[PDB]
Design a protein around this ligand. Sequence first.
Ligand SMILES: O=C(O)CNC(=O)C(=O)O
Ligand SMILES: [Mg+2]
Ligand code: NI
Ligand SMILES: [Zn+2]
Length: 331
Amino acid sequence: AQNPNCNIMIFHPTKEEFNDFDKYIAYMESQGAHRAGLAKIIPPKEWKARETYDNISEILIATPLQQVASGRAGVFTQYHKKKKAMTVGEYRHLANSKKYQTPPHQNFEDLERKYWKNRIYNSPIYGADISGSLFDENTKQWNLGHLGTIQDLLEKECGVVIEGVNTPYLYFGMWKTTFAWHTEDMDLYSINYLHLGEPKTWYVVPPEHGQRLERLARELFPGSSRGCGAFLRHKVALISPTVLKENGIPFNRITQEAGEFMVTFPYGYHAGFNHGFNCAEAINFATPRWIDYGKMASQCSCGEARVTFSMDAFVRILQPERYDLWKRGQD
Ligand SMILES: O=C(O)CNC(=O)C(=O)O
Ligand SMILES: [Mg+2]
Ligand code: NI
Ligand SMILES: [Zn+2]
C-alpha cells in the first residue's frame, strides 16, 4: 500500500506532465497521495498563471466577512459578520494596517504559535467565496476555470445528464483569516492555487480517519452536535493542533506559498489560516474515484449549511433516499 503513514506528498511535475490534469491526479493517487487528504503541487518553472498581478485592485469584494470567534484558544467557533463592500485595493490597505497586519515573527512555526495563542482575540476580515478567476485565458495547463466539470464527470461515469455548473472562487485573505474544519460539498476534491501574497497554513486529517475527527468534534461542540448530525458542514468549528494531539487524532500540516497548488481529496477534513494579505483561487472537481464518496457523503439538513445550485442534482442522483429531507433543509 503506497503512503501507509498518510503523509502529505509534494509533487514537482515537468512541463510535459503538466499537460494532462486528470492523468496527473491519477498518478498522484497511484503514489498514495490521497491517503493524506491533501497534496502540494509545485508547477514547472516554465509555467505561469498569468503575466502580472498589477491590475487586480479594482476587483470588488461585495460582502467582506469579519470572522468573530467564541470559545477558548484551541477550541472555538467563528461567525461571519457581513461588512460593507470594498475593492481589493481597499482590502489590501486594510490588511496592511496596524490593526490587521502580520506581527513580527521568526519563521512559519513562530507565526503558527502566535496564531493559535491569539487568534480568538481578534476579528480579521476575509474576502471569501467571490466567483471569478485570475488565470489568463491563454494559460492552458492547470487553469482552474477550464477544468472538466463535475456534471460532465457524473455523466461520463453514470450516464445521467444533469443541470448545474462548476466555476471557481477567489479568496482574499489577511493575517488570521481562518478556514474552519470541513470536507468539500459532497466530499468532492478541491484544488487551490495561491496566486499572490503571504502563505496559507493547512491542517488535514487522512480520509481513512475522518470519523475520528467527527467524534472529537461532537465531544467538543456538544450543542452544535445536538443541533445537526453533520454540523461540520456549517464550516464554523476550529480545533488546534495541540488539541488534536491531546486527543490522538491523526493529522498533518503544511504551509502553501504563492505559486503553489494544493489538492484536497474526497473526505479529507482540512482547516487553516492565512499569514497575511493574499489571494487564492479554488474550485471543486471530481474523478471516477469520487463517485463512491459522493454516494456516502453526510449531509446537513438542519438548514444551516445552505449551498450552491449544483448540489441539488448530486444529492438527487447519488443519494435519492436523502433527497427529500436534504431539500427541506435547503427551503
Ligand atoms: O483557502 C481557503 O480559505 C479555503 N479553501 C479551501 O477549503 C479549499 O481550497 O478547499
Ligand atoms: Mg482590477
Ligand atoms: Ni476546502
Ligand atoms: Zn446543519
